UniProtKB/Swiss-Prot annotation:
UniProt gene name: LYZ
Protein name as annotated: Lysozyme C
Catalytic reaction annotation: Hydrolysis of (1->4)-beta-linkages between N-acetylmuramic acid and N-acetyl-D-glucosamine residues in a peptidoglycan and between N-acetyl-D-glucosamine residues in chitodextrins
InterPro entries associated with the record: Glyco_hydro_22, Glyco_hydro_22_CS, Glyco_hydro_22_lys, Lysozyme-like_dom_sf
Annotated PANTHER family: LYSOZYME C
Function per UniProt: Lysozymes have primarily a bacteriolytic function; those in tissues and body fluids are associated with the monocyte-macrophage system and enhance the activity of immunoagents.
GO molecular function: identical protein binding; lysozyme activity
Enzyme Commission identifier(s): 3.2.1.17
One cellular-component annotation, GO: extracellular region
UniProt keyword annotations, A-Z: Amyloid, Amyloidosis, Antimicrobial, Bacteriolytic enzyme, Disease variant, Disulfide bond, Glycosidase, Hydrolase, Secreted, Signal
Disulphide bridges, residue numbers: C6-C128, C30-C116, C65-C81, C77-C95
């Protein structure tokens, strides 16, 4: 599923993301925007290290989910990476919450540092009723 901006903003709010560990909804929106263009089926295989980024938040198989083909791989979210390719984003949101509980928080995503950190991200939730 390729979410429309505001639809996703409300979907995320209903899932308890607004202010989760101090992260505003607009930051989560900016993250999904740049990671996958709000596309739940997005996948990026990294040939250099054998890992794969899955779903709307492009969560990596090395530490976060199990796909059966990534070495030493943790499955910190205790999910099949398959769960991160569903139209329903509840599992992906549960896993993104798990990621941010780590020291780095949302900084774990390089694309958020590159395109959301220290930026005006208000536009992502404007007019969405969130």
């Amino acid at each position: 599923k390729v979410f429309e901006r505001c639809e996703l903003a409300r979907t995320l709010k209903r899932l308890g993301m607004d202010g989760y560990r101090g992260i505003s909804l607009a930051n989560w929106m900016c993250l999904a925007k740049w990671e996958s263009g709000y596309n739940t089926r997005a996948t990026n295989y990294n040939a250099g290290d054998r890992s794969t980024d899955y779903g709307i938040f492009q969560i990596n198989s090395r530490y976060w989910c199990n796909d059966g083909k990534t070495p030493g791989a943790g499955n910190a979210c205790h999910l099949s990476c398959s769960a991160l390719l569903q139209d329903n984003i509840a599992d992906a949101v549960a896993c993104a919450k798990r990621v941010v509980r780590d020291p780095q928080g949302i900084r774990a995503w390089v694309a958020w540092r590159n395109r959301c950190q220290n930026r005006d991200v208000r536009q992502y939730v404007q007019g969405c009723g969130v």
